[PDB]
C-alpha cells in the first residue's frame, strides 16, 4: 500500500493557483474553510440556492459554477453524485483550462462515465473517510481524518503532487492518504452506507425494542443502546485501540465475562448473506439504477423515508431522552468562518 | 421518571463527611479523582496490588479496606461484583459506622444477596452509564455522563441527598441522574454487555470479513467498518441528535438513498429472538452462576479469551491500520492527578 502523511506532501504545488470548490454542502464547506485557513486561494461555484448565500455569509468569493471553473487551476466537484453528469457536460468541461485538475470525492460518477477524462487535463479522486463537521473540527485541532486517492488521468504529469497538496491543505495527510482505485472506493463506500450503517442502527433499535417490550424503562433502554454516548465512545475509542481492547481495558470483570460469553455468537448466517447480496446489488449496477430513479424526483421518496423514520419508537424515545438529559456538546456557531 | 440535575442536588450533605473509595480501578479512580477535585474529603481503601501503588502515585491517602471503612461516613464499593460478598462480610460490615452510607455502582451483588442492608446503616446504588476515562474527561470539561440511582435501605432518612451529593461531586447531575430499581439496572446493564456490545462488534467484524473475502483492500475494509472513526462519530453524534438524523444531516443524497433502501429491513427475527434468550439467561440466574464459575482461579478463562481475541483477523488488521494511519487522540498522562483550574477555566 502507498500511504501519504504530511512528510510525503507539500503546499508548494498550490503556490499561485486558485482552487474552485463546486458546491458548499457537507464536504464543500469543509474543503473551502480548511483551504482558506491553509493560505490557499479559494473561490466557490454554486447554483442559486441557500448554499450560495451561506458561502457569501462565510466571506467566500461566490459565483455560478461556469465562472468559478473558468477562473480555477484545480476544480473540486463537491455536489451530489447524480448531479455530476449535467454539471460536468454544461458547466465544467467547456470551461476547464488546459492543464487544470478536476477532483471528485467519490468514484461513482467515474464508474458510470458521467465524469470522464478530458484531453489536456488531469482527473483524480480524493475521497475523505469522514463527514464535514469532524473534518473541520479535526483541522482546527491540528488533526485530520483518512482519505483514499486515485490518479485517473494525468496529462500534466503533476496530478499526484497537486491532489496530495489539496489533501495536506484540508488535513487528510495528518491521518494518512492511501492509493485506492476509484471503482473499489465506490463499491466499498456504498457497502458501508447500505449494509453496515443500517444494520448497526437496526441492531441498536432491536436492543431498544426488546428491552421496552420486556418492561424496561424506555428512557433507560434508549440510554443504554446509544443515548448515553457509551456505545459511541466504545466505537470511537475502538478506532484507536481495537474494539475487543476497549472491553479488556474499560470493562468490569462482570462486563468482560458477559461480552466474551456471546462474542462471535450473536448473529445469524443471514447477516453475512445480506452483506454479500448488498455487494451484488452494488457491483452489478442495481443500486446505481435505484439511485437514478430516486434522484429523478429531487429525491421525493427519500424525503418521505426521512419523515417516516422520525415517527419510529426509537426516535420518539430519543426526543424524550434528549429533553430530559443534557448531552456534552461544543458550540458550532462560526466553525466555518476564517481562523 | 425522577431525573436529578445540578439544581436538584447540593454538596451540603458532604460537609464534614469523609468518603472511602473501596477500589481504585476503572470506576474507583474516576470517583476518587472527581471527588478530590470537587473539594470532598476522600480516602482510598485497597488490597496490596498495583492499584494501591497507583492511588499513592496519584496523591491519595491509601490504606487497607477495613481501615478506610472504619474512618468513613460514606463507602463506595468499586471492586468487581463477584468480590463484593467476601469483602462485605470480612472488611465492610464489621467496620461500617452507625448512620454510614454504603453505595454500589451495579445492582448485581444486591440481587445475589452478597451485599445486604445492615441495621442502623444506609444502602444505595449509584450506577454510571459510562466507563471511567470519559467520566473523568467530561468532569474536567464541566460536563458529565448520566447515572441511575436507587435507595435500598435508609435508616438515617438522609440517604437520597447523600447519594445525589456524591453524584453532583462526580459530575453525573450535569447530564441527569434517574431513579431506577437496582434489580432492573442489573438486568439492563448485563443485557447491553451480553447482547448489544458483542452484536455490534460481531456486525463490524462480519462487514470486515465479507469485504476481505470479496477481494477488497483489508486496510480500507477495516477503516470503513470502524477504523476511520466515522462509524463511532455517527454513534456519538447520534447520542446528541438521533441516528437517522445524523444520516439526514451529514450524508450525501447517495448515502441517504442507500441507507434508507435497507433501514429497518436488515435483520431477520433470529436477532430479536437471541436478544430475548440473553435476557432469559440474565433474569433467571444462569449468567450469575456462569460468572461465579468464571471468577475461579482469578478469571483464568477470561484471560485466555482476551489473549485469543487479539489474534482474530479484525484485530490483526487493526494493528496494521493503526501503525499506518495516525488517529486523533488527547494526551492521558496525569488525567487522574489533582486538576487545579485557572481563572479562564
Ligand atoms: N457527505 C459527506 O460527508 C461525504 C460526501 N462525499 C462526496 O462528496 C460529494 C458532495 O457530497 P455532499 O457534500 O454530501 O453533498 P450535499 O448534499 O451537501 O450537496 C449540497 C451542495 O450541492 C449543490 N447541488 C445540489 N444539487 C445540485 C445540482 N443539481 N446542481 C448543482 N449543484 C447542486 C448545492 O448547491 C450545495 O452546494 C459527493 O460526491 C459525495 O459522494 C464523500 C465523502 C463524504
Ligand atoms: N467498569 C466500568 O466502567 C463500570 C463499572 N461499574 C461497577 O463498578 C464496580 C467496579 O468495577 P470496575 O471499576 O470495572 O472494576 P476493576 O476491574 O477496575 O476493579 C479493580 C479494583 O478492584 C480491586 N479488587 C479486585 N479484586 C479484589 C478483591 N478480591 N478484593 C478486593 N479488592 C479487589 C482492585 O484492587 C482494584 O482496586 C463494579 O461493581 C462494576 O460493576 C459500573 C459502571 C461502569
Ligand atoms: C464498554 S462499557 C459497556 C463497560 C463499562 C460499563 O458501563 C459497565 O457496566 C461495566 O464495565 O461493567
Ligand atoms: C454517516 S457517513 C457514512 C456519510 C459521509 C460519508 O462518508 C459518505 O461517503 C457520504 O455521505 O456519501
Ligand atoms: Mg463515505
Ligand atoms: Mg456493567
Ligand atoms: Mg454499564
Ligand atoms: Mg458516500
Residue numbers in the entry:
A (entry chain B): 3 to 341
B (entry chain A): 3 to 347
Question: Which statements did the authors publish about this structure?
Answer:
A trait of BP bacteria is a conserved gene cluster coding for the biosynthesis of polyketides (malleicyprols) with a reactive cyclopropanol unit that is critical for virulence. We show that BurG, an unusual NAD+-dependent member of the ketol-acid reductoisomerase family, constructs the strained cyclopropanol ring. A sequence similarity search using BLAST predicted that BurG belongs to the family of ketol-acid reductoisomerases (KARIs; EC 1.1.1.86), well-characterized enzymes that play key roles in the biosynthesis of branched-chain amino acids. Biochemical assays and a suite of eight crystal structures of native and mutated BurG with bound analogues and inhibitors provide snapshots of each step of the complex reaction mechanism, involving a concealed oxidoreduction and a C–S bond cleavage.
Apart from its function as a catalytic base, E232 also plays an active role in substrate recognition and positioning as we gleaned from crystallization assays with gonydiol and BurG. In one subset the active centre is populated by the enzymatic reaction products 6 and DMS. The second subset clearly depicts the backbone of gonydiol, which was oxidized into its enolate 14. Intermediate 14 is firmly held in place by ionic interaction of its sulfonium moiety with E232 and cation–π interaction with Y133. In addition, the glutamate residue (E232) would ionically interact with the positively charged sulfonium group to firmly position the substrate in the binding pocket. Inheritance of the redox capability of KARIs allows BurG to activate its substrate gonydiol as the electrophilic intermediate 14. This activation is vital for intramolecular electrophilic displacement of DMS as leaving group and subsequent cyclopropanol formation. In the case of BurG, formation of 6 is probably driven by a gain in entropy and removal of the volatile DMS from the chemical equilibrium after cyclopropanol synthesis.
